[PDB]
Amino acid sequence: HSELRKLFYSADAVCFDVDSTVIREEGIDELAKICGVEDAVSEMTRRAMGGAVPFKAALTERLALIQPSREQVQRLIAEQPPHLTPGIRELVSRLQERNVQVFLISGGFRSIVEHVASKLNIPATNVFANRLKFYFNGEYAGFDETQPTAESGGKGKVIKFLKEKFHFKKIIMIGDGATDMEACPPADAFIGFGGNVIRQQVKDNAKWYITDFVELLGELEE
Amino acid sequence: HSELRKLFYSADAVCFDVDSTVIREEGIDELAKICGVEDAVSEMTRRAMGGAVPFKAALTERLALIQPSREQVQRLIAEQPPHLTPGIRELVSRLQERNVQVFLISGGFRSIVEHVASKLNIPATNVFANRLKFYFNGEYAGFDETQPTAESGGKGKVIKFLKEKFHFKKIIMIGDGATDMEACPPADAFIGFGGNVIRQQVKDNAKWYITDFVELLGELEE
Ligand SMILES: N[C@H](CP(=O)(O)O)C(=O)O
Numbered sequence: 001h002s003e004l005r006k007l008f009y010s011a012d013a014v015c016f017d018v019d020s021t022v023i024r025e026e027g028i029d030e031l032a033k034i035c036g037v038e039d040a041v042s043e044m045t046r047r048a049m050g051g052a053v054p055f056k057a058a059l060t061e062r063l064a065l066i067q068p069s070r071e072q073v074q075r076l077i078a079e080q081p082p083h084l085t086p087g088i089r090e091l092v093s094r095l096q097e098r099n100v101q102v103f104l105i106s107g108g109f110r111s112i113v114e115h116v117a118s119k120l121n122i123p124a125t126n127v128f129a130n131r132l133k134f135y136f137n138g139e140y141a142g143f144d145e146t147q148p149t150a151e152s153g154g155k156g157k158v159i160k161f162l163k164e165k166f167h168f169k170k171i172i173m174i175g176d177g178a179t180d181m182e183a184c185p186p187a188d189a190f191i192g193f194g195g196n197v198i199r200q201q202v203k204d205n206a207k208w209y210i211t212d213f214v215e216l217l218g219e220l221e222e
Numbered sequence: 223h224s225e226l227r228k229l230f231y232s233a234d235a236v237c238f239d240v241d242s243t244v245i246r247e248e249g250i251d252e253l254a255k256i257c258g259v260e261d262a263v264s265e266m267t268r269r270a271m272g273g274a275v276p277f278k279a280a281l282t283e284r285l286a287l288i289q290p291s292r293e294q295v296q297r298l299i300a301e302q303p304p305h306l307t308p309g310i311r312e313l314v315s316r317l318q319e320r321n322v323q324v325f326l327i328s329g330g331f332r333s334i335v336e337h338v339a340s341k342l343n344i345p346a347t348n349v350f351a352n353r354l355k356f357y358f359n360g361e362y363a364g365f366d367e368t369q370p371t372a373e374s375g376g377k378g379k380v381i382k383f384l385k386e387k388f389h390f391k392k393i394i395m396i397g398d399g400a401t402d403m404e405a406c407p408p409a410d411a412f413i414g415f416g417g418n419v420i421r422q423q424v425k426d427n428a429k430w431y432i433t434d435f436v437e438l439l440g441e442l443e444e
């Protein structure tokens with residue numbers, strides 16, 4: 001491990017996944033759970049197997065029903081269902097402290113992630129997810145469809161944005177699934193993370209895969 | 223005119239447009255006023271006339287220009303700019319007691335046009351106005367593009383979709399601009415209006431061009 005190594009503090013940027021990595025809960029499956037469409041949606045996932053369906057349709061569909069009112073995502077935020085995965089709040093601090101711009105990247109919703117941000121004392125400007133839309137009524141209107149993460153494989157389209165513009169050079173992506181990982185070729189280094197989720201197909205092909213956000217404290221100190 | 227005008231007592235269902243027919247000022251220009259686009263929006267609508275480009279196109283621009291937030295549109299119905307015309311309330315109130323159907327077909331936003339519908343006591347479902355989308359953070363995000371009132375000749379779409387639906391014998395349209403008039407053929411009959419706004423087009427060209435419900439309420443109160 002010494003290899004890491006402050007491998008990490010040789011970085012100017014460290015982009016984090018929120019769902020399943022920055023936090024134990026997913027961000028979409030929760031919205032549905034608070035909508036009485038809980039097992040209705042969790043039943044929508046088994047067939048993407050095939051994935052036919054691409055990411056935009058996929059989400060435009062599972063979302064095409066939830067029909068998350070503004071209210072409802074408000075009740076969600078109010079209930080604070082999101083629970084951070086245990087050494088993030090402090091890990092993000094030890095980073096931005098040493099003078100590193102922490103970022104958050106999700107296929108989830110800016111409504112939720114933003115709140116997640118404040119609790120990591122992460123800037124608001126440093127967040128990237130789908131922007132949910134509502135009618136005056138507060139009914140589900142869809143969602144921003146130009147946002148980098150509304151299309152398949154747009155997770156990296158952003159990580160190479162953050163560089164195109166602020167010119168970081170040497171940024172890390174902490175993520176749990178192969179979408180987070182596939183972003184490494186566009187981004188400098190990928191640290192897998194299973195928490196909560198082991199997702200074998202990353203724990204097998206990925207270099208540098210931690211079990212928990214604590215494993216990286218002892219080495220971080222020394 | 224041949225007076226007393228069986229026009230109205232025979233009637234099954236009458237419907238009027240919202241913007242300076244049943245109300246004093248227009249929602250778009252008034253909304254644009256609290257955004258600083260007043261002069262700019264005002265000048266676009268005026269050029270929008272008898273062969274002007276469709277509705278759907280030009281109201282994408284105007285709104286793209288204004289860019290109204292859930293905070294701006296909600297506080298408007300605070301300043302409640304919408305002013306009912308003199309003889310609108312109890313003209314419709316009159317006809318509503320007799321068991322007829324009254325409707326609001328307007329190329330405005332129900333976000334606003336429904337505050338009007340309320341107390342004229344018209345249902346909420348008897349209002350056809352395109353909706354305005356909004357982000358969770360309350361910012362402009364387009365408008366429902368699937369609504370009849372969102373494109374040109376839209377008014378005659380909801381009307382002809384109103385007879386097949388509820389099945390009426392005497393549907394009467396009442397508007398101020400030729401637009402609201404282009405729908406007469408689908409509807410049984412049309413009555414103009416120049417109380418707030420003038421525009422010859424319709425003044426000298428239709429049957430029973432009433433100016434001001436006051437000036438037709440007299441023979442109506444008959
Ligand atoms: N891309 C997701 C992460 P998220 O659902 O936060 O977008 C994964 O592959 O696990």
Ligand SMILES: N[C@H](CP(=O)(O)O)C(=O)O
Nearest residue numbers: 239240241328329330399
């Ligand atoms: N299209 C509007 C009518 P409304 O504002 O009711 O949509 C006009 O005649 O100028």
